[PDB]
């Protein structure tokens, strides 16, 4: 396939893949993504940093051939860099190794085992283990490896301060534009917020630790393994610092499910009370919405509301999927215990709301109240929802 490489610095090219058609990746919705791979041309050696998903190498090979042609060099890779084991960045490693068998493969110690487990043809490949720190001179260009998850590492092109961070600072976006400044800021920052919410939230304590143990001024560009390349590294570093420390807006994310609309009516009434205080509201209906967009909004919300009816003594089963996700994400690790209210309608003994409150506490939320009612809410019951929402909104505005 004929595909053009994109020059990002003198002798440095983006030779990645545009996955236009993917809509879902590990239960994270998207409108396509990119598998960013980079080609570094040293005076003596040519290095390929990461690659792409199995079966999507056609664009990558085309761009590698195009970059080599533009540089007046032969179609050849001398050094292979594998910052991560995950198949979206290592899927083409067996074919890259088969084509250039003498090119050493730079990766972490644990990554050798993971790579061979994914691709048995790599047994006996020339792996060059990176233990904490390792450097390679390509002739006028130096690549320094920083072992960071154990399977991962960062690659720094030292002379120009270009950090190949792999997943970190990534965003799932698929555009013809390669840089951060070429797309609308809102699209970039919202995609960055979604990527942090779904993939970095449980690592928030480490993000804070690493940042303090690195203060960063030398980083001129952040080239991640997904989406846009940051020509303004401080913009994403700053965003990460805010998310990791729990800097939120006067906003509440309301999530609910319903069978006959009573819990839905309660959710809308809570929102009215919150809005009367000028606090922002994001409303999610589990029958139509999904977990990745919900957690993106929870990330900068000072409060979270969860409602569901009772069905055979348990809350409606859809809450189970979000609860399991929140249990893995650990939002309390951002250093903030977001406020929460549990609610729902019931027709007999109830119990769904009590289960919700208990699970919200386990997920790191500060549960302030619970509100369970019988069948259809009356006007007075809806006013109670409004009053509870209003009081919560007052508390949200009072939080640091």
């Amino acid at each position: 396939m004929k595909a053009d490489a994109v020059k990002i610095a003198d002798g440095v090219y983006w030779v990645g893949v545009l996955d236009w058609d993917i809509r879902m990746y590990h239960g994270y919705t998207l409108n396509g993504t990119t598998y960013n791979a980079y080609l570094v041309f040293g005076d003596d050696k040519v290095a390929l940093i990461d690659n792409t998903y199995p079966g999507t190498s056609a664009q990558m090979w085309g761009r590698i051939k195009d970059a080599c042609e533009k540089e007046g060099r032969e179609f050849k890779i001398d050094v292979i860099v594998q910052n991560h084991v995950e198949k979206d960045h290592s899927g083409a490693l067996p074919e890259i190794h088969k084509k250039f068998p003498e090119a050493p493969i730079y990766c972490t110690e644990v990554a050798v085992e993971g790579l061979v487990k994914h691709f048995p043809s790599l047994k006996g490949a020339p792996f060059k283990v990176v233990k904490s720190l390792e450097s390679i001179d390509l002739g006028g260009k130096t690549l320094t490896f920083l072992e960071a998850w154990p399977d991962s590492m960062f690659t720094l092109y030292a002379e120009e301060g270009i950090l190949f961070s792999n997943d970190a600072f990534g965003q799932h976006l698929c555009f013809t534009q390669r840089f951060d400044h070429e797309i609308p800021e809102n699209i970039l920052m919202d995609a960055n917020q979604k990527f942090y919410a779904n993939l970095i939230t449980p690592l928030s304590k480490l993000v804070l630790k690493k940042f303090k143990e690195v203060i960063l001024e030398k980083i001129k560009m952040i080239a991640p393994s997904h989406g846009q390349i940051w020509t303004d590294p401080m913009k994403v570093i700053g965003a990460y610092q805010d998310f990791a420390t729990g800097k939120c807006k006067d906003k509440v994310t309301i999530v609910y499910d319903t069978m006959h609309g009573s819990t839905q009516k309660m959710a809308h009434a809570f929102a009215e009370g919150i809005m009367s205080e000028g606090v922002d509201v994001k409303m999610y209906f589990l029958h139509n919405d999904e977990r990745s967009e919900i957690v993106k909004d929870i990330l900068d919300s000072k409060a979270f509301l969860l409602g569901a009816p009772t069905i055979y003594d348990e809350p409606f089963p859809s809450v189970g999927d979000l609860i399991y996700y929140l249990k893995g994400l650990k939002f309390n690790r951002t250093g903030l215990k977001r406020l929460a209210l549990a609610f729902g309608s019931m027709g007999g003994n109830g119990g769904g709301t009590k289960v919700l409150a208990e699970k919200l506490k386990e997920c790191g939320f500060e549960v302030l109240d619970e509100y369970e009612l019988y069948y259809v809410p009356t006007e007075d019951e809806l006013e109670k929802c409004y009053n509870m929402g209003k009081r919560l909104a007052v508390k949200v505005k009072e939080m640091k």
Copy 2:
């Protein structure tokens, strides 16, 4: 709307609604359903047994008017019977009451409160609280009520047209089917019995012990031999009542087939490869297999197959120390359904792939135990399974299948 009533007995008509277009109802998938309502013409009183979902009364009114015209009676209802509070059978009660305000509403004590909570316009309506074995004479036709608490709600009851042995069982014995055909014998048996199995699995499973109790009470009173027809609130009318009674007795007592239901989720296909390998080992023993991929399948079909499976396999990869979140939904459903209530602890295996510390499979095993399953083993592997690892899955599947065949 012009809609014809269907005569089911002398002076008895089906005046129900065909919900052709509904595809999902309280997280239960279907290809339409019916809200079965019945009109009983006595010499003195006309009784309406149940009604329909809010906003779907047009077909119902058309059929009621057609039945009244056929019987040379005035368009009038004298008795309203509300077997259940649930809006798919009570949704038209406010408009039925507004039209005929003198007609008493027969229901249970708990039902009065539930109905008024759903429809405030019913405050002050003529409710008539009824208890088991109490009766009303319509003139040559008798309606006998039987409280069916927690079948499937506490405010539930059954109405029996005693002279013809027609049991208006509301949700019990129902099936979510929407056909032009009204009777059990008019459609393929496999479609009828599979829809009946799905309805039991999703709505009657936690009530299994209560089903066995209500049955022994109905037998001791000599009422079972008197039932000539079962007219439920959804699907087909049973002209063979023993067929569905027998099916319910089997599901409530845990009568299963030499069958395994395998459910899994995957991000990179490794857990999927494991699931396929377990299936191969099970099949080598002649045991049946039903395979569900949580990325495309849903909870109602899964539990339909669990109902007559002696074993259940659940697999998912590890994501941030937890199993893939889609399992959370199925686990929460299984926690409510309580398959142990059938009198049987189905066998189970937990499995999955991981890339670091793992832990997903341990969570799965723990949750399966909480759901009443007898967890026999756990199998967690690193990334892509090797040929040897897939043979281990096949061997584990083979051993489980041997145990399945050994169970009663």
Copy 3:
């Protein structure tokens, strides 16, 4: 239900409904919408302009009661204004009329018939047929009607507030009521989608109605545009300007590529065409019919200078999914905007083919200028993919030349 009204001017409130949960409306995808209704407090009469979708009136009543309370007035509506017949704006009319039976209902002659057909309980309601340029004095506040079929605009003369119903609306559901309170990119993209899906076939009418209003001088009197969905425009020229651009066919150096596939060959061709287009610095939007839908596709076609459509051949015809998009494009009539967007038809086949020829023919019927067709046998070779790249490159050169 308790719900707060939002004051938009002195004695003027938004008493609308936030439909948080709707995800699809007449085959148009969205993340909720609003049914904007307005309450105008005159010294003598209180007027309600439009209402909401059947079954969603709880928020509306709450906001009306809240606005009445804030104004120190009784819970009373004296005048009902029905700008449009469509149920998303008239659904609560039977209950508004039942509550205030003496309040006249202001609407066009054709609207009366349309409203009674929707709601039989309105037979005998006090309808007040309005002619164009007819006014009502509420006491210090004047409402002027402009018949634009059963649809009309209401102008609150004193403050220049134009209640435009669907025109200038956007399907957005936020706590924020004004255009300036949300990111411009979100507002303008939602406005582009609304124009693409609902105003495109009316482009010639948009141009004529604008040309007259400018020479007449009405446009300079508009200080605010309060539509029936989404954000209220505090900057009316921003949306008027956007409409003028869409109506005249002002496009970007961009190509929208739409395709479907059974075995991946047409998909490979589509990606190769995109590579050739990109080599010329031209923008590309890629849509796969197995996962994507018509409302987002047409939003991108609106500002694209070219459109590519590809599908394999199945029983002498193109893959059936194209039929849906073609039927939509036939009704939207993009050719009318004043420009004929460039187009290429493509696909893979395994026997006699013919799908690509059908595609080219339908693209021509939809008003596109079809430059070429490319049909190949089964899996594309490296040379065939380079041909796609070359065709996409040449098309991109032509796009930049327009």
Copy 4:
């Protein structure tokens, strides 16, 4: 992967793939399918008939190895048979050829070109072009090729016909035979397969049947082993079904398809159904907002009438109808020898026109359009009675049509 082969006859095994997880294939919905491949052990040569979809060969290799072990033979394929070029049956051909490069590949002349186009590694492979009624001996077992790029392979001694797609069904069960699953499931899947894939070939099927009957080869068929689903131990059951579908044998049934934006067309569709039902005629109702083309055409296949409704949007019918119309234009239901009856309907709010477009497209698709009914906004009680009256008349015409 370890996977067991299934013995179908002495020295004949099913070595296919169970695609448990597939839910959609070329716009045809399903709950998994199978890619049936067969291993024939002769005294001298071992033949593999068809294979599987690319990337799904693990089960296939496991079943081939298991069959060879059970036969006390070495893991070896001496003959490769390729009945079709389609990747769901030829996807593993490059790896089968790489493993056994000396094994000739039997296929049609056109098949060679198609296979090499799909898999460039096959350039120079030992292809053996086969023409009609040509045979090969495996040692006590004979394989006869029947040209249909597609073809049929007949194991002559036991009368086993490897029909490839013909007589196939998209079903994925542990059970391999027709008699081991409920008849309704089998016959409904067979009806869906005919509707979506054989309908435009109806006249050719009738020709190819009369030719197989004249030769007296039909009475020789003891088993039909297709490339998808169940193996027919009762070949006449599926042959009979095919004869009925190809000749237009239908039930007193009507398929109603509609789309709506505000529910008015939906109310009309329900009212037409009420009138049809008052005549004892069967009804299948499809809402295009939730349903899809493959199930719709399955029911059209044995319906004597078809109703299509949609509102008017910018002078055109709701766009979802365009997809079904394009599908029906390819399927050519008039090829069954019957012009099914049809009514076009819809609601509108201005000038209308959607119903006229519907009627025109239904005629193009081979339907006999009897009437059109377009109304303004919400139907009144009287308008719903008119739908009911029209449905009743159509139903009377349906009952009057004979086979």
